[PDB]
Write a structure and sequence with these properties.
Chain lengths: ~110, ~120
Amino acid sequence: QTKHIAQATVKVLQSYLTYQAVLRIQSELGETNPPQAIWLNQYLASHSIQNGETFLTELLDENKELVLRILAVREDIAESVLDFLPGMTRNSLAESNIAHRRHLLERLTRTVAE
Amino acid sequence: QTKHIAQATVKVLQSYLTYQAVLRIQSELGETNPPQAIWLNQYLASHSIQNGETFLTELLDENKELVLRILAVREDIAESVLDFLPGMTRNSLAESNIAHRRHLLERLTRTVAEVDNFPSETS
C-alpha cells in the first residue's frame, strides 16, 4: 500500500510541477514571442495537462523546443521547492487538524448548550 | 514566486492525501459497517474532494466521527510518505528526462533519414 501511494503521489506532484512550469513559460512568451504564447494557450485548450508526462510526450512531436524549455523550468521549480514540502505540508496538516477540531467542538457545544 | 508555488503545491498534496485517506477508510468500512461503506462511497460521488479542506468541512454537518477518522488516517498516510517525496520525485524527474531524450533521439533519427534520402522519407 504505502509504496504504491507514494508512487501515485509522486505522479500527481510531478504533473503539478509540469503545469507550474507551463504557466511560467506562458508568462515568458507573453513578452518574448506572443505568436508562440497564443499557440501554447490554444494547445492547452485541447490537450490535458493532468498527466504531465503524456502531455509532454505528445507536445514533443509538435514543438520540441517548448518541451525542452518546460523540462528545464520544471527542474528549477522542483529544486527550489521539493525539500520544503515535507515540513510545509506537516505544518499545514497540523493547522488543518486544529481548525476542523475547533469547528467540530463549536458544533457539539451549540448542539449541547440549547 | 517560489514561496507561492510551494504553498500551492502543499494544498494539492494535502487534498490528494485526504482523498487517499477517504479511500482507505471506505475500504475498512467494507467489512466493519457495509451500510456506512456504501454511504461514504455515494457521498464521495456527489461531493468534490479536489479541495480536501472544504470536503471535510461539509462532511462535518453529516458525520463528525467520520471527519476525525479521515483526519487521523490522513496523518498516517502523510507520515508514511512525506519524507520519501523529495527523493522519489527527483528519481521520477530523472526518469522522465531519459524517456523524453530517447523520444527526441527517435525524431532526430527520422530527420537524418529525411536528409539522407531528401525529399523522400526513407529507403
